[PDB]
Amino acid sequence: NVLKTSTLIRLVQLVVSFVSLWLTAAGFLHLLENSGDPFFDFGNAQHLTYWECLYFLMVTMSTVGFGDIFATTVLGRTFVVIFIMIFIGLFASFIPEIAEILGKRQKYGGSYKKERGKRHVVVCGYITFDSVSNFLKDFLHKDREDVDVEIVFLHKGLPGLELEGLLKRHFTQVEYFWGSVMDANDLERVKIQEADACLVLANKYCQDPDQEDAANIMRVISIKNYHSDIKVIVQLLQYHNKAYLLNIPSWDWKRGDDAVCVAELKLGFIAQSCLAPGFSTLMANLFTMRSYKPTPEMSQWQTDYMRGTGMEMYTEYLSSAFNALTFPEAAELCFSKLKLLLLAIEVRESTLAINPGPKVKIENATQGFFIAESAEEVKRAFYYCKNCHANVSDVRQIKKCKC
Amino acid sequence: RQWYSFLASSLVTFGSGLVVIIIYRIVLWLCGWMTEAKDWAGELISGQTTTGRILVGLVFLLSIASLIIYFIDASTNTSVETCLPWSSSTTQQVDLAFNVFFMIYFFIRFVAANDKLWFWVELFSFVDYFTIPPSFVAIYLDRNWLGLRFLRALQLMSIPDILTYLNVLKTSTLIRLVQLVVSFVSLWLTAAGFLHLLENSGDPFFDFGNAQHLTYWECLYFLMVTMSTVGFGDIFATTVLGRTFVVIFIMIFIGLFASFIPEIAEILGKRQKYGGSYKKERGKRHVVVCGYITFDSVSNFLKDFLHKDREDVDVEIVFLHKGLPGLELEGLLKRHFTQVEYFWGSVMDANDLERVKIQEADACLVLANKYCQDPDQED
């Protein structure tokens, strides 16, 4: 049972038959030439080694034919003519076979290998050049706040040319595997236990979204069943399909699993834009990486706009200097003293509150939500001291041992 | 027979480091300052550091320089071990300098090795075990075995990545091509050195008395004459080792090539038959056509627009459409080819509007399917 699949069987059959033909034919020619032949009363022999005859049949079977070891018995010559034809005939019958058993190989087989401290996240579902691009252009954006993780796709069937071009264009970061998250063996090839999350993607233009959402749910069931505590993020098409995720035993959004719903957000942005014109873009930029790269030939309005597109959301724990302030005071200090815009806070029992009323106090070690240039720019809110640093003018030194 | 002194140095280098790695692992099985250098070496090898990238480019260029020293040595003629005293001699010690540079680089990787086992049984580690140790034997013994020094040529396999770093090649087709062509010359150059060594040596069964004094250039030619299956029989081999290497070379070339026939067919087949741009011949005017371009829709227009008289005025007629014309339209196009041009493309793309010089065409005509199954969509 050393060989298993039909391809290896055939191969071994073909290769065995080939060496069997070659070894035997060499003995036959060796006999004739070392004998001479009866027409010349065995006087016309060539004293060839069997090794020369084995070599000579390779040199002729390959159609190279150096003409170093030519035959001279009439029986040798006539055997060589038959050998040429019967080899061409046998080989021509096997050309198709060879082409098939060569062609059956998967171009995207194998397993992912975990390079110790290098992290990665898995992607599966509706993987297509467009659906990949709009994700990948953010996930592999030219800055990420200086963090790198590998991105590993698995899908069944081939990527198609445009996606293969995109894959090759990023090949140090990205990997693709033939397979499906419906199979525990593929969840093992892709080391799901050692990936830190899995992202599941869907066809926004599916001709029946109930079926696409049913298919994407199935997966989350497969992934959660294989290893309970994995982080999962799933793209649903319709709103009401979210109900089914809450039924899965090891689904927990407080723990940190999540579902993004296309119909919920797509119309929700449009709706807020009816209440406040243009707001859709304020939102769409504030939650996606953009490159602030001002140049002198830009218009004045384009430069101010871009700097505005450079803004990002971050979150941080506030300094003890914020203890028992009211929210408007914390916001005034963040804006005026730190040059940070503070939107919202985590408050205990967990809940999120945006622009809280003056009736609240900011409690110790609450997490705040900031709009800023970079995560580094926000760290001042964690460090700032009402005794030690409130006197400081230039904010680029607020991190210190005094507290 | 001085040559055994050289190849022994390669063998003991490989075997002693192998045994040390085996001891390490089995001892740790049967029972931190490194970690900075580990990752720092990994960066320099990645070439995401500009230094690491530069040094990789230099490692590659210096590998090409090493082969020139080998071809000059092969240009010296005479037997496979032949020498004169090294004292201020010729140019020799430049490849000692290159060998220690490569051994230093080999230590870097050893540091970055991950699994020492698979690092020690690596193709380029074999290249290093063969070339590095005999270089010292040569200057020490005051003698020169030509040896396996041509193996360094496998570093030509760097070219696809170097041209990716410099971004000289872009599309997947050019990538592949360059990979295939590089692998082909790497195989050809190296195989020639291997055969050259055998035949100029003779072989042990005939106590090295049966040699052929082939140049490396003859061996490089001879492998082309056999790889092409032409086989003139002018430069036939005669060592048993040469003959048996030639038999293996024939089979392994046929096997490699047969695996790549499909690939070659695909990367050949992907070319657009109707690519390119229209070039404006100054005072010659033209008008653009696009939309439902089909043999019939073309014909009934074209038979008026290119009618045998027009009141004596001539302008070129330039179609663009996505996908191929089909045979009957291609026949009509060839039948008028001095007047008419066809381009793969669409007026939905500003780059195609530029290839077709829309700013310098004097009009554009847009054509539609009269028999569309839903005219609202066609309109």
Numbering used by the authors:
A (entry chain B): 214 to 561, 567 to 621
B (entry chain A): 14 to 44, 79 to 426
Task: List sentences quoted exactly from the publication behind this structure.
The large-conductance calcium- and voltage-activated K+ channel (BK) plays a fundamental role in establishing negative feedback loops to control the firing patterns of neurons, transmitter release, insulin secretion, and smooth muscle contraction. A voltage sensing domain (VSD, segments S0–S4) and a pore-gate domain (segments S5–S6) reside in the membrane. Additionally, two homologous regulators of the conductance of K+ domains (RCK) in each subunit (RCK1 and RCK2) assemble as a tetrameric gating ring (4× CTD) and serve as the cytoplasmic Ca2+ sensor.
The R3Q-apo data set, however, led to two classes with C4 symmetry. In the resting VSD structure (R3Q-apo), R2 faces the intracellular solution. This narrowing exposes a more hydrophobic profile due to the side-chain rotations of residues F304 and I308. In this structure, the side chain of I308 represents the narrowest point in the permeation pathway (radius ~4.2 Å, HOLE). We suggest that R3Q stabilizes a deep closed state of the BK pore and that conformation is evidence of an activation-deactivation gating mechanism based on reorienting the S6-based inner bundle helix. However, the tight closure at I308 was sufficient to occlude entry of bbTBA in R3Q apo. In the R3Q-apo, the αB helix is partially unfolded at its ends (residues: L374-K381), unlike in the R3Q Ca2+-bound state where the αB helix (residues: L372-R382) is reminiscent of all our open structures. The CTD at 0 Ca2+ exhibits a weak interaction with segment S5–S6 at PGD in the R3Q-apo structure.
